[model samples]
Target: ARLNRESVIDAALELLNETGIDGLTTRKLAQKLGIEQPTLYWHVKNKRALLDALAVEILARHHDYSLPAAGESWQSFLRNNAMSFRRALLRYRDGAKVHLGTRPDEKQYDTVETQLRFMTENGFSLRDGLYAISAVSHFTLGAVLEQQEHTAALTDRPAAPDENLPPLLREALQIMDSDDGEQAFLHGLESLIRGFEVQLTALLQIV
Candidate 1:
């Protein structure tokens, strides 16, 4: 059977789902597809390229770049987008893991541009908008990475008390543990956006 790029990528994705990133290899993929390793290379140059394409395919399925209507607030728009990305990451086996190292391709660019446009519209200067977007992206990525790692065990569990711990540490632990893990993530995100809103408002007033 003739294998095209799509078929090859599909096979790679299937292999990823079955065995995860560590277990996936070009030779293994070729075997699964009933093809020679060199033939697989004809479709994707290497494991890195294959992984990049897989990340792109996964993200493209989850994210839609179209902006929300004019009446929507930027914060709300951004929160929805962040949540959408998180949910998408949760969909595939090790989806976040697959995406972590992949560089931002064209589809990823669309995601960034959509958020940048929203930031600019909401009174942030271009540089500030870029920074804000970067901050949000990093926060989401880091949070999701931690979330994925802890999902099976104690992602949201309260920290154990240490006899030597400071009062502040103990208080923080109490609050953090009592908080809903999902809501805690949203709270941090919202807090960042809220701070930006105030800063941007002041800057606009001066302008």
Candidate 2:
């Protein structure tokens, strides 16, 4: 009687932690849940559906800055929202992969509407608001993908400082190798928001 959609998703997320996105087969999930494939399928039709549900659950559980606080500046909202998103994706194994192609569900509609409305109220056209959100979302996703995959790929064979390389190239590599991605993410995030500030100012001037 307890094997409902919620319970299935919870068990599936636990399976995801152990198996990762590539290894999280429905068969494995069924085995973990001590249920047959048909029984599990009653809750989630396929792997894609399971992943879609997981993606939403990850955001619902961890993404705290979905909407701007009252009187929050658009720039600050974008920065905080991006940080919250990056944290959520980093919370699970292969989380970015799970989130990459999933469509937003009805539960997200009001939150999304408020986000866009926030931008419009702060002087962005709807198109520009969407563009801004898209830019931040894509940037955060790429950052998480690079961080997660790079860390995973380097686990077995860590990169060493190449002494034979040209000085500038070697220096660049050293700088990047030293960072666990936070410095770069913050730098890029600031740059992105600054660019938006410039654009918003220009747009305001045209009015």
Candidate 3:
């Protein structure tokens, strides 16, 4: 339809999905918005700033988990946050890639402060909390990227395959697709949390 700030940003994301980050440009975005190039930059200064806004917008869309809940354990807090982040990334077009391209800057201060506070309150040190957050963020990003790519690779129609496929390869593919993606993600997240839990326990024992 028509272009407003919100509509334009949404269009920009859609265009990015079609043309990719490299191919998305101000001129193309304006065309998508049905506006001139200069008008496109009226609300958002530059592409980098627009991307930064998009990243925060995606994260903010999942504030339920991003903003830690009352009486949450450090593990629960991080899990919730990571789950929120992953869900948010999956909602957008190439969102994980977009997030990695944008910078968070000081805009993330409050959410991050609350996250750290939740960790400290749950008896983990600031340093360890930082490590835990990093582990989850990195893991979440990697999983989302791979999942997005895998999803994008799929065709509307099924591939040509039959029961005549090789036993070993078929067995492995069956095993891989056996579990739900979310289940596998959480399983790996639990492993990561337990690894951090060990370090936290040892550090606490020294006190």
Candidate 4:
């Protein structure tokens, strides 16, 4: 059977789900596809390249989100797409880790331009728009990474994070003791949105 870039990426994603990022080797991918390891290399160059291709493919499965129609709010566009990005990351095993490892080509993806335009068109400065988009991207990536790692290991969690601490440090420890990952994620996401809104609020303060 003839092979192509998409085939290589497709096989690589399946191998990722089966063996995760570390175990996804060129040899294993080739074996699974019934091709020689070197042939696989011809398609991807190296393990890193293969991983990069896989990351892009996995990201293309983002949840259904509608483009903003005329007169729609940019913040609304951002909140929906940001959450969609998270959903895409959680679609596969080790998805977030793969994304974090792979470097996307800025030139190929107009993602930054799109976000920048969204904010600027909606009455914000381009710099503020850039910061808002960046905050959401980093926040979503970091959030998903934490969630994936937490799901990956059960032994790393300590029984109690300093339950016998001094009174001065007691409140801090208690604040960090919650095991509620979902609740924390939603709270942090909303908080980030509000933080950006604060910036928008000040921008329109009518000075």
Candidate 5:
């Protein structure tokens, strides 16, 4: 019997789960689905396209794109959105790696729009909103990629600060090494948001 698209994609995802992004391929997906390699071409044109679809599916699974309720503060909306995006990227095996490469589709646009709207409603100019969204996005992606690398056991333990290093480096290392990485990420994100608010307020005052 010919396999359906979902079955083929599911098989591909399973392959990804077992072997990760670097080890997955159309040939392996075909074998997993008990179909010919050419049969996969019937559903997905190429590996990049397949990966893009997989990324879209992953994001779509978690993103609702619903606007915040009336009187909801921008900070609340942005923090929730950031948390949702991070959680989505952590869902699948090698999810952050896979998602980092694919171009954003409709779902990404919806997410960006939702974020931008929140900033705009909070007195950010259009340009400020755009910059804020991009900045927050880059920060979140960097944090998630770091988390995924650590989760995959691909990261080395931090080297002990050299005895000859600056005093600040030793203090920073002590603080960094003492806490849960996830809590550290949240702290950084909160600081970034607070910094942006300070900048936005200053800009508005000067305007």
Candidate 6:
């Protein structure tokens, strides 16, 4: 089959899962694709371009709840979108890092515009809507990064206990180190959404 941009991204995502962000390189990707380095470059200009495509493709492929459903409240949309984004980032190795600095693909323009419009229609200023969306994204990204880093470190030796540490601190550490961070993530998400509600009320002077 003839190669196209989407096919190239598909191969790269597969390679990402195999080698992780640090290990993914154009040279290795070319070899995996059974093509010369130059041929691969013809599809993706360089490693950064490839990584950017991978970042966008990851969300395009996995993030289903990005848009609001008909009649869904802004708060509900934010919660669903955040959960969807987090799940997408957690799909591959170092997925959060892959998304760290990449710009949104051109393909996302309409979707993004619609999201911003949704907020505006619901009484937020465009700037505030962008801030809201960005805040959610930043929070979700940080959460996923923390979770992914701990998962990656699981192969190494566990942290040694510090006897001198306060009991409350140790208890917190134990909770943080549990097999899953779902509880913490949920609590944080609720707090963030509630904060947004308060801000929205103030912004609209809904007293």
In terms of lDDT, the best-performing candidate is 2
For each candidate, what is the lDDT? 0.75, 0.89, 0.77, 0.73, 0.75, 0.87
lDDT of 2 by residue, 54-147 (tens): 9999999999999898888999999999999999999998999899987678989899999998999999999999999999999999999998
Pairs of residues clashing in candidate 1: none
When summed lDDT is taken over every stretch of 10 residues in candidate 2, the lowest stretch is 155-164
Q: Give the per-residue lDDT digits (tens) of candidate 3, residues 119-151.
A: 777777788777888889999999988877666
C-alpha TM-score for every candidate: 0.77, 0.92, 0.81, 0.79, 0.80, 0.91
Model 5: per-residue lDDT, tens digit, 1-207?
Answer: 357767766777778889888878888887777778787778868889888888887777765433565787777766776777778877777888888856668757875676677778789988988887667778888888876676567446664548787899888867765753667878888998888888887964863
Off by over 4 Å in 4: 66-69, 101-108, 155-180, 204-207
lDDT of 4 at 87: 83
Ranking by lDDT: 2, 6, 3, 5, 1, 4
Task: State the displacement of the C-alpha of residue 17, model 5, in Å, after optimal TM-score superposition.
Answer: 1.8
Alpha-carbon RMSD of each model: 4.4, 2.2, 3.6, 3.8, 3.6, 2.1
Task: Give the TM-score comparing model 3 with the true structure, all chains together.
Answer: 0.81
- Cα shift from native, residue 28, model 2 (Å): 0.3
Quote the lDDT for 6 in model 1. 80
4 or 6: which has the higher lDDT? 6
**Once model 1 is optimally superposed onto the true structure by TM-score, how far is the C-alpha of residue 45 displaced, in angstroms?**
1.4
Task: Judge candidate 5 against the unseen true structure and give its global Cα lDDT, from 0 to 1.
Answer: 0.75
Best by TM-score: 2
